[PDB]
Amino acid sequence: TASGVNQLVDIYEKYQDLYTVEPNNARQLVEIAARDIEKLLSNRSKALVRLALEAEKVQAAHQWREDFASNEVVYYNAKDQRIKPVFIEDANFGRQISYQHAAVHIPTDIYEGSTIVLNELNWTSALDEVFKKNREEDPSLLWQVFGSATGLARYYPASPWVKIDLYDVRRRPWYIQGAASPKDMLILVDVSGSVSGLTLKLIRTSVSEMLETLSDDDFVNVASFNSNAQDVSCFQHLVQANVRNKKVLKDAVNNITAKGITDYKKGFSFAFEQLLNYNVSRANCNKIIMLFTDGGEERAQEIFNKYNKDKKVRVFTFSVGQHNYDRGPIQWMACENKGYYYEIPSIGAIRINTQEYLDVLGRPMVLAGDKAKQVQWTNVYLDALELGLVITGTLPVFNITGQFENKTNLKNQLILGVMGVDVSLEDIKRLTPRFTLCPNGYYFAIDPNGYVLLHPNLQPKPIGVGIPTINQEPVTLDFLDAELENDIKVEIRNKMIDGESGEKTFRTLVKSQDERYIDKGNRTYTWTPVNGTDYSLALVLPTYSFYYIKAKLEETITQARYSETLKPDNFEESGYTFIAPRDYCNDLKISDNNTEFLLNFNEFIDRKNADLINRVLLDAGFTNELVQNYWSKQKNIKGVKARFVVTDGGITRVYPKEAGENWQENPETYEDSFYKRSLDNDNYVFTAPYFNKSGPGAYESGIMVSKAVEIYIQGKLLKPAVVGIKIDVNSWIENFTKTDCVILDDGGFLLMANHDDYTNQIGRFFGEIDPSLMRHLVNISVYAFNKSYDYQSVCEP
């Protein structure tokens, strides 16, 4: 009676016009979104290709000057002959931009004006023209970066660098992805008595700073030999170097101690055995062993002749520490195999040495002329210029000095570096318009490794690992770890990775938007691969989201009264009115001052994406009609503290105009928990307020109710809006009294308990009130539970 569900249904029905219930095909939509994202990535790939060719061409003709005192090189250092820039405070990046000269970022420990940096700056000064050409032939392109292999970083939109600047382009994920092919490392940390002391600390730090340089598609393990080749971890084979396994390996390395007698033969035999463990799903290429040792005197010739006969493996060796032992065997080991020998005197040399093996690993791909010029996208990762979540494209640029002269006797087998472009996930999130879907639907895409990309539960902050401690890693959520995991969904994940395109339907569980409920529901999936790249876009529609209410309007008078309907001055007679933040053609987004956004909307509509505005105004009109017809008439029913209605678009109306002052729900209805849940279920749903909140509630707000207004417009189930009442707690407590009686809901939240002490603590999860009763209640086949994991959350300890 209070909300008046049938009243809203009749209001919708009587206006059979003003509607066009188009069906979300759920396959054509997926295909078109896939094509659009592929087109975007193709634009970026084209920009990368042209930049790479230009860089190669310009480098080819440099002449290697060596006297830069005269004809000084002019550039703009980021950490500010330097240039004096003028910055346009463009809103695309959220910081300062210039658009007329490419900044530079020389890492702190590199000298500004050496004989190598200066040459890099000169010969890259030609890249500015092509940068401008790229950014001009199509705007909305965020960053073009050039991580040359000398520490530089020439990114075109010149902004001041974002305190000790530790950035070093040769270590970023988007550089390693380009500089080398995947790897199968095996770090032979030398924990023998000869390294105890400082050298052990250097070994542990170096191993950590090396594991920092492994992507998610290249495996790793950490052996250690002291006359016995144990494993510092619990793995015993290669483990994919996720963001998590890296944690275990780092902890194991940190908790290591020297002992025993050095024995290279046994350690290397064990290592080469571990690289022949083909039945553990290894990455079959770049079989690498990277021995960490102080110094040795026994070159294990026998083992290198038994195994690695065909030079399959690539043995690198570091003579870490400041010592005086023989470095002959180590150099010979690095030389005989297709390896390379380093030296780590002390901290400070770790960062610039552990990353150098990529230069060696790039030799085969350089020797393969253009078979490697393939744009290779990375996995999501927070920007380095506080921009958000961006995936990067990479395209290595080779060194052609003597090409077409055919000298082929030079250092022509090394890459200049990697030149990459960044795509904001906020720019893929507008090629997948979620608004036409119901609040339950959404898109998502996955790497071939399964890690998500463009997923609603992908919050922008680093993925956490392990419990915190008392005192840059990519954001990689596995698609099963972003949603509830059951038997069926794993099949869908497996079928997306292979690229098989298909459709599936079933009944499953969906975690509520506030992480306090679970609901059964049907979710007609959909998945196709984007032929351009290695991704498989998906789309999850419930069974009632197939059709959406599009709005068509031409009178200019009906939309007129709809437009002045929701004016802030009409709240007293039309109730409060939020508006969700939705990107109109050019309207500025919300600054969480919903009133100011509403005023801006008023001005824009007074002046004059059109469907979105059309349909939000349609919802405004219908909600006004409902409230004025019924809510205004039967004002202040006995047990109704506040009457509220939520629709799509963002028209949230709360009648009293005072409860709106106590309306904690987000204006974006697609993010309101009760809306999605109320849509999912088929009965009134009660959402107990949280307990011990800073703000008020549960006595001056009243518990909430909701019931989606199902519609039969022409024989199709639609659920546009949701209506409910914040039932006053006191009157309903009286009603309860007139009948230890406890009223409870799924999620174990006390809506009531006759005992007066309990009802004071209304809304707490029952279970910290009388545990044993629930503990047994779970036992009798009611109140099951699912104990999932959240990988993005904040803890104080």
Partner 1 sequence: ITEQTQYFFDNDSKSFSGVLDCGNCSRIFHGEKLMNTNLIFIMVESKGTRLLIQAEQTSDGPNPCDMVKQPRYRKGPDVCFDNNVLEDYTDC
Partner 2 sequence: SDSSKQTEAECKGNYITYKDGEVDHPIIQPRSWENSKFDFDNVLAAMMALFTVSTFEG
Near partner 2 by CB under 8 A: residue from 347, 410, 599, 610: 347
Q: 190 labelled as ligand-binding? A: yes
Number of residues that bind partner 2 (CB under 8 A): 19
Breaks, C-N > 2.5 A, in the chain lie after 80, 162, 471, 608, 739
Instruction: Give the N- to C-terminal CA distance of the chain in Å, as an integer.
Output: 50
Q: How many residues are present in the chain? A: 797
Write the binding mask 242 to 261 for ligand NAG: x where contact by CB under 6 A, - elsewhere.
Answer: -------------x------
Residue 379 found at the interface with ligand NAG (CB under 6 A): no
Contact 155, 145 (CB under 8 A): yes
* CB of residue 454 to partner 1, shortest distance in Å: 20
Whole-angstrom distance, CA of residue 574 vs CA of residue 568: 9
Residue 791 found at the interface with partner 1 (CB under 8 A): yes
Near partner 2 by CB under 8 A: residue from 111, 227, 486, 606: 111
Residues facing residue 511 across a β-bridge: 518
Closer residue to partner 2 in complex, CB, 40/198: 198
Handedness of CA 227, 231, 237, 239 (dihedral sign): negative
**Inter-CA distances, 665 with 71, 576, 670, 692, Å:** 63, 13, 11, 17
Structure tokens, 338: 């297709």
Residue 457 found at the interface with partner 1 (CB under 8 A): no
* CB of residue 59 to ligand NAG, shortest distance in Å: 5
Residue 110 found at the interface with partner 2 (CB under 8 A): yes
Q: 194 labelled as ligand-binding? A: yes
- The full DSSP string for 145-183 is EEEETTS----SS-----------GGGSHHHHHHHS---
Near partner 2 by CB under 8 A: residue from 80, 109, 136, 138: 109
Residue 284 found at the interface with partner 1 (CB under 8 A): yes
Closer residue to ligand NAG in complex, CB, 347/410: 410
Whole-angstrom distance, CA of residue 462 vs CA of residue 312: 37
Near ligand NAG by CB under 6 A: residue from 80, 112, 138, 273: 138
Residues facing residue 724 across a β-bridge: 644
Q: What are phi and psi of 550, to 5 degrees?
A: -80, 150
Whole-angstrom distance, CA of residue 727 vs CA of residue 638: 9
Residue 614 found at the interface with ligand NAG (CB under 6 A): no
Residue 123 binding partner per list ligand NAG, partner 1, partner 2, none, with a CB distance cut-off of 5 to 8 Å that depends on partner kind: ligand NAG
Tell me which stretch binds partner 2 (CB under 8 A): 105-113, 132-140, 491-499, 691-699.
105-113
Per CB under 8 A, which of residues 687..746 are in contact with partner 1?
740-746
Q: Which residues contact 470 (CB under 8 A, 6 or more apart)?
A: 797
* CB of residue 150 to ligand NAG, shortest distance in Å: 8
Residues facing residue 442 across a β-bridge: 540
* CB of residue 686 to partner 2, shortest distance in Å: 50
Per CB under 8 A, which of residues 178..207 are in contact with partner 1?
181-182
Tell me which stretch binds partner 2 (CB under 8 A): 344-352, 391-399, 663-671, 711-719.
344-352
> For residue 652, what is the enclosing H or E element?
strand 652-654
Tell me which stretch binds ligand NAG (CB under 6 A): 120-128, 434-442, 523-531, 701-709.
120-128
Residues facing residue 478 across a β-bridge: 451
Residue 166 found at the interface with partner 2 (CB under 8 A): yes
Q: What are phi and psi of 55, to 5 degrees?
A: -65, -45
Residue 760 found at the interface with partner 1 (CB under 8 A): no
Write the binding mask 37 to 56 for ligand NAG: x where contact by CB under 6 A, - elsewhere.
Answer: --x--xx-------------
693 burial (CB, 10 Å; 0-12 / 13-18 / 19+) is: exposed
Residue 99 found at the interface with partner 1 (CB under 8 A): no
* CB of residue 617 to partner 1, shortest distance in Å: 33
Q: At what angle do helices 5-14 and 611-626 cross, to 10 degrees?
A: 130
Number of residues that bind partner 1 (CB under 8 A): 105
Contact 462, 477 (CB under 8 A): no
Q: 501 labelled as ligand-binding? A: no
Residue 309 found at the interface with partner 1 (CB under 8 A): no
Closer residue to ligand NAG in complex, CB, 125/449: 125
Contact 524, 541 (CB under 8 A): yes
Q: Is 789 helix (H, G, I), strand (E, B) or coil?
A: coil
What are the binding residues for a divalent metal cation?
Answer: 190, 192, 194
What does the binding site for ligand NAG look like in residue numbers (CB under 6 A)? 39, 42-43, 58-59, 62, 64, 71, 122-123, 125-126, 138, 255, 399, 401, 410-412, 416, 484-486, 784, 786
